């Protein structure tokens, strides 16, 4: 479903003589808390020998966009392990919020590279501070003064099965 950003922290259980664990923190994009926790546990297991049964979640907090009404350019680290071995991938997306950017990135990955959500790992999502730092042409194109373009071939959705007007598209 629609993604959400959750702050997930782990404090792998303190054994005898080792209180106050390191309290590792993460930012996980997921549709709900359960999926966020599952992905956090999977990442923690992958990184080091910790396991879900050996630790617990400290706190889960949803990270809301600071400015969900501002248009921003995002640079995203993309690493996916299909079909061949994992390789680095960088994509630039223009969106109003980080969650929308992540959703668009996942949709584009599924559309083009057939990579599934479980097969894609998001390492970094960074907002580009200044213009001209964007490298991909399809994003820099919209960063032009007084950008104006038409929408030719407008199509009107007809609720009725029959039309007597021979609908015309305008223009």
């Amino acid at each position: 479903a629609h993604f959400k950003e959750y702050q997930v922290i782990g404090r792998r259980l303190p054994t005898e003589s080792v209180p106050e664990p390191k309290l590792f923190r993460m930012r996980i994009f997921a549709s709900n808390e359960v999926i966020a926790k599952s992905r956090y546990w999977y990442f923690l297991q992958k990184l080091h020998k910790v396991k879900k049964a050996s630790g617990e979640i400290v706190s889960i907090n949803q990270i809301n966009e600071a400015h969900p009404t501002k248009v921003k350019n995002f640079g995203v680290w993309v690493r996916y392990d299909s079909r061949s071995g994992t390789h680095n991938m960088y994509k630039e997306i223009r969106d109003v919020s980080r969650v929308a950017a992540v959703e668009t990135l996942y949709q584009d990955m599924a559309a083009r590279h057939r990579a599934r959500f479980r097969s894609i790992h998001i390492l970094k999502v960074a907002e580009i501070e200044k213009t001209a730092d964007v490298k991909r042409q399809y994003v820099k194109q919209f960063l032009t003064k007084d950008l104006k373009f038409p929408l030719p071939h407008r199509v009107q959705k007809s609720t009725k099965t029959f039309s007597y007007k021979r609908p015309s598209t305008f223009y």
Partner: peptide
């Protein structure tokens, strides 16, 4: 091609 690739080196 990452604009802020330098920040990774600074963090390292």
């Amino acid at each position: 091609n990452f604009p802020y690739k330098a920040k990774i080196l600074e963090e390292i």
